[PDB]
């Protein structure tokens, strides 16, 4: 009796797989047909064959879904900062403090090339740098660290090490990763959408 009931449940899986065949294909065929025409122009707009404007800038950001490291975001800041620290341990440069970090970050961001980048991304970076800067403040405070660098048990300066070379590398890496993560003009933006939803 158990074997019979077990079979009754099992056959439903086989029946479902048989039924799936046709309907899904029909949906996909209709959908890709409807969307196939669109494309991403060199102006960053997306236009139908007639030349009308569908979106003024693909996706609001212009980014490309197939080039995202974070959860629907182009970057995951703390992971990048961590990577740059390990790749470039700079035992020579002195440890930076809140004021020094904020001053040096502002000076680097002043360069015109970063001004060419998107505003939103710049704001988020500023926020992240503020965040780490306040965190190091707590750490340097609790342990009685001195900003002049003269504290005796020098191991205490390893707690939140960060140095100007590392800051500059991080900012360059951030800018490049953002910049190269855009929807290359001429992509077939429609077909990618129909295929992704259909699957």
């Amino acid at each position: 009796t158990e074997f019979f009931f077990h079979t009754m449940a099992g056959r439903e899986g086989l029946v479902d797989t048989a039924v799936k065949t046709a309907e899904t294909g029909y949906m996909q065929r209709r959908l890709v047909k409807s969307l196939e025409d669109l494309c991403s122009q060199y102006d960053l707009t997306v236009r139908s064959s007639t030349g009308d404007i569908i979106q003024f800038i693909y996706g609001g950001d212009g980014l490309d879904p197939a080039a995202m490291e974070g959860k629907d975001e182009p970057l995951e800041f703390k992971r990048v900062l961590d990577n740059i620290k390990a790749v470039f341990p700079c035992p020579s440069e002195p440890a930076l403090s809140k004021n020094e970090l904020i001053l040096t970050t502002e000076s680097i961001m002043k360069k015109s090339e970063f001004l060419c980048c998107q505003d939103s991304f710049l704001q988020e970076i500023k926020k992240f740098i503020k965040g780490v800067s306040e965190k190091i403040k707590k750490t340097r405070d609790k342990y009685g660290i001195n900003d002049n660098g003269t504290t005796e048990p020098r191991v205490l300066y390893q707690l939140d090490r960060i140095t100007p070379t590392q800051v500059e590398k991080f900012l360059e890496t951030c800018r490049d990763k953002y910049m190269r993560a855009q929807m290359e003009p001429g992509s077939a933006v429609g077909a990618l959408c129909a295929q992704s939803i259909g699957e």
């Binding site: 750490t139 609790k142 048990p153 191991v155 390893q158």
Partner: protein, 148 residues
Amino acid sequence: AGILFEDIFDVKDIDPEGKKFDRVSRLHCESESFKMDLILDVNIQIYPVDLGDKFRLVIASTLYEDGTLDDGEYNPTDDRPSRADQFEYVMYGKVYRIEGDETSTEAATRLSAYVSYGGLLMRLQGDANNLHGFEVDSRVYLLMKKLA
């Protein structure tokens, strides 16, 4: 001398969570003179360790006690005298994380350093003064010997 840190410990507990592997144990230790606490893993097939042992360990920058720092290569078949001659169990590893004992809101003067011996973890914790010289990414040797 290239010694970074040296002290006598005593073992306190072996497997707080019970047996996990067939060749490794998670020692919990405490230090006699200073009040460091240690977590260490040893290959108990070759260096078996009992629940009551006492031992001295030294963490050193180099095995050439004369002070030579030619760390270009290491040859297992070497025979010239070296600091390894005075110990019974030697490992090689890297210090890969240093952090503060955040549990203390005030009088925060205790640190924790992690040394990873190619899979076999260790953590050494206590007052800041005794931990001078431990640096991230530095490579160090661990030497150990049992005492009666």
